[PDB]
A = this chain, B = another copy of it.
């Protein structure tokens, strides 16, 4: 009778409750209060309704999906994945997520509070998988949206350590899909060989998706893995903050990137990276331009800490047959980055910023401009030949450097004979501090190695802070690089003993709208007259010089060379010195040569 009802599954539905014995409160039943929360245990049961304990020999997938499906049908809620248990997944999902090698299908308004651990069983060894998928169709173009889905807690997603079976396979933790107001917070992703841990958005469809306070640990482990980017941000108004990324595999030093920022109004801030090849790509792929336009703008990489083996930030933009991608309005600021201990040339070329070619190697498709790199530090150990503040390997329409501290082998670099980028609006302000770790290492090398097709509307203000007499020059332009409407200066400090300071192998510093200054040694000879007397250079390669002035003391009593010099049409320098007593004088002086500055 009553006893039967009480012991039945409807029993709690018969036991009355009123909150805190408050006579103003609702007269409820116990079941109503229990129904305010929901866990995996409410679906983790056999066909007779008996609870099943999780474990390595139990496949929890169908139970978790049934939980998600049911809570979705009531307008959403939060399913707890209980602490103190490991929940194994041991089969693929069915329906719209099967095209994505999906395990679990996420649904709108259904949050997951992961307190325990979710592990992959060895069914997945050597196979593709995406553990949580928010697409609802195998074809992403035909997918509905995922909205208001949050995964959070103190728990763990463990990928079982399994290697990839083939390089062409894809593996992911969370693919939110066409995702609006979705987020992952607090979760540890660990122990795998995967392509991505989390992907946000799809080809610009989505908004307001975030990854916050998550850990990603040891997510590459094999030579089969083609590539890895821990978070791929493929919708606007989205980003990554306060996360921790670590790899230990040798392969990760060559293939793994922490973040991809691929749509406008996206950010990467406050995070720590160790053991990765790359920090972040900031890219507009034409192939990804469907949902949010063809421009990646308002891109922010700030206040991160990194030890990487390749490049910290990589910029790109590219084209398809019918769409052109553009990258502009970027800020890279406050980051403290180093190339980890490694041999020269043992990983991809070390760089703070890389202007990279497209995925096919094309360097003449990019449209990258209005970038600001400010207030960052970069260090590479002295042996790492392949380290640069910027490797400028594809067409650049602008990039501005102010008030950074770069301590590596090169400042600006591109390999000769390779690509010949067209460079516009490259600005290197004098407030960039050039470190001394690589002093004495630079035999045969140019600190600024301007291996470009052409440079226009650019500024390079070189300022040393210590000597490095091993370098061939501070800045060199090969004769193949056109230079125009530019300002190139070499501050004299720490340069007195340098054989070459600025080198223009095509004599490009003569251009009508080139503004330069740099130190040089010049031999002069005077006329014999007592009194005010001209001094003239012996060499005739100064027809471009607008003024010069002495950087040398005068050890003579009986005369003095000119303090300042102009030129003559034959290319000599000329200035008026003073012979206290007459005689032809011959001196070698260090001058600051100036053109239009």
Asked whether any CB of chain B lies closer than 8 Å to the CB of A525, the reply is no
Asked whether any CB of chain B lies closer than 8 Å to the CB of A105, the reply is no
In the complex, the chain B residue whose C-beta lies closest to that of A561 is: B566
A577 to B564, CA, bound (A): 11
Are B457 and A436 closer than 8 Å at their CB atoms? yes
Chain B residues, CB < 8 A from A466? 425, 457, 485
**Which one, B154, B372, B576, contacts A150 given CB within 8 A?**
B154
Stretch with Cβ within 8 A of B (4 or more), from A28-36, A356-364, A388-396, A409-417: A28-36
In chain A, positions 361-394 with a C-beta closer than 8 Å to chain B are: 370, 372, 374-375, 377, 379
Chain A: interface residue total (CB-CB under 8 A):
167
Chain B residues, CB < 8 A from A115? 77-78
Are B15 and A27 closer than 8 Å at their CB atoms? no
Asked whether any CB of chain B lies closer than 8 Å to the CB of A95, the reply is no
Known contacts A237-B272, A547-B550: does B43 contact A25 (CB below 8 Å)? yes
**Which one, B19, B31, B485, B560, contacts A467 given CB within 8 A?**
B485
Are B21 and A13 closer than 8 Å at their CB atoms? yes
Give the shortest distance, in Å, between A226 (CB) and chain B (any CB). 28
Are A18 and B49 closer than 8 Å at their CB atoms? yes
A513 to B469, CA, bound (A): 13
Asked whether any CB of chain B lies closer than 8 Å to the CB of A158, the reply is no
In the complex, the chain B residue whose C-beta lies closest to that of A574 is: B560
Known contacts A303-B303, A465-B457, A496-B596: does B20 contact A49 (CB below 8 Å)? no
In the complex, the chain B residue whose C-beta lies closest to that of A456 is: B466
Are B547 and A549 closer than 8 Å at their CB atoms? yes
Asked whether any CB of chain B lies closer than 8 Å to the CB of A181, the reply is yes
Are A302 and B305 closer than 8 Å at their CB atoms? no
Stretch with Cβ within 8 A of B (4 or more), from A81-89, A171-179, A248-256: A81-89
How many chain copies? 3
A196 to B307, CA, bound (A): 31
Chain B residues, CB < 8 A from A551? 546-547, 596-597
Asked whether any CB of chain B lies closer than 8 Å to the CB of A402, the reply is yes
Are B77 and A49 closer than 8 Å at their CB atoms? no
Give the shortest distance, in Å, between A375 (CB) and chain B (any CB). 5
Asked whether any CB of chain B lies closer than 8 Å to the CB of A459, the reply is yes
In the complex, the chain B residue whose C-beta lies closest to that of A487 is: B493
A550 to B550, CA, bound (A): 15
A595 to B22, CA, bound (A): 85
Asked whether any CB of chain B lies closer than 8 Å to the CB of A242, the reply is yes
**Which one, B17, B83, B513, contacts A76 given CB within 8 A?**
B83
A433 to B461, CA, bound (A): 13
Stretch with Cβ within 8 A of B (4 or more), from A4-12, A280-288, A316-324: A4-12
Asked whether any CB of chain B lies closer than 8 Å to the CB of A59, the reply is no
Are B26 and A44 closer than 8 Å at their CB atoms? yes
Interface string of A415-445 (1 = CB under 8 A from B): 0000000000101011101011000000000
A329 to B22, CA, bound (A): 53
Are A374 and B375 closer than 8 Å at their CB atoms? yes
Chain B residues, CB < 8 A from A16? 6-12
Chain B residues, CB < 8 A from A333? 303, 334, 375
A298 to B272, CA, bound (A): 9
Are B298 and A338 closer than 8 Å at their CB atoms? yes
In chain A, positions 315-356 with a C-beta closer than 8 Å to chain B are: 329-331, 333-334, 336, 338
Give the shortest distance, in Å, between A220 (CB) and chain B (any CB). 19
In chain A, positions 444-479 with a C-beta closer than 8 Å to chain B are: 457, 459, 465-467
Interface string of A479-499 (1 = CB under 8 A from B): 000000101000111101000
Known contacts A270-B269, A372-B377, A577-B576: does B84 contact A74 (CB below 8 Å)? yes
A491 to B404, CA, bound (A): 22
Are B550 and A566 closer than 8 Å at their CB atoms? yes
In the complex, the chain B residue whose C-beta lies closest to that of A402 is: B403
**Which one, B6, B560, B566, contacts A15 given CB within 8 A?**
B6
Asked whether any CB of chain B lies closer than 8 Å to the CB of A522, the reply is no
Give the shortest distance, in Å, between A29 (CB) and chain B (any CB). 8
Asked whether any CB of chain B lies closer than 8 Å to the CB of A265, the reply is yes
A597 to B549, CA, bound (A): 9
17 contacts between A and B (CB under 8 A): A8-B16, A11-B16, A20-B35, A25-B45, A84-B109, A241-B242, A269-B270, A372-B377, A374-B403, A403-B403, A425-B466, A436-B457, A493-B596, A546-B551, A557-B568, A563-B564, A574-B578
Given contacts A372-B377, A402-B404, A467-B513, 4 further A-B contacts (CB under 8 A): A9-B27, A429-B433, A554-B566, A564-B564
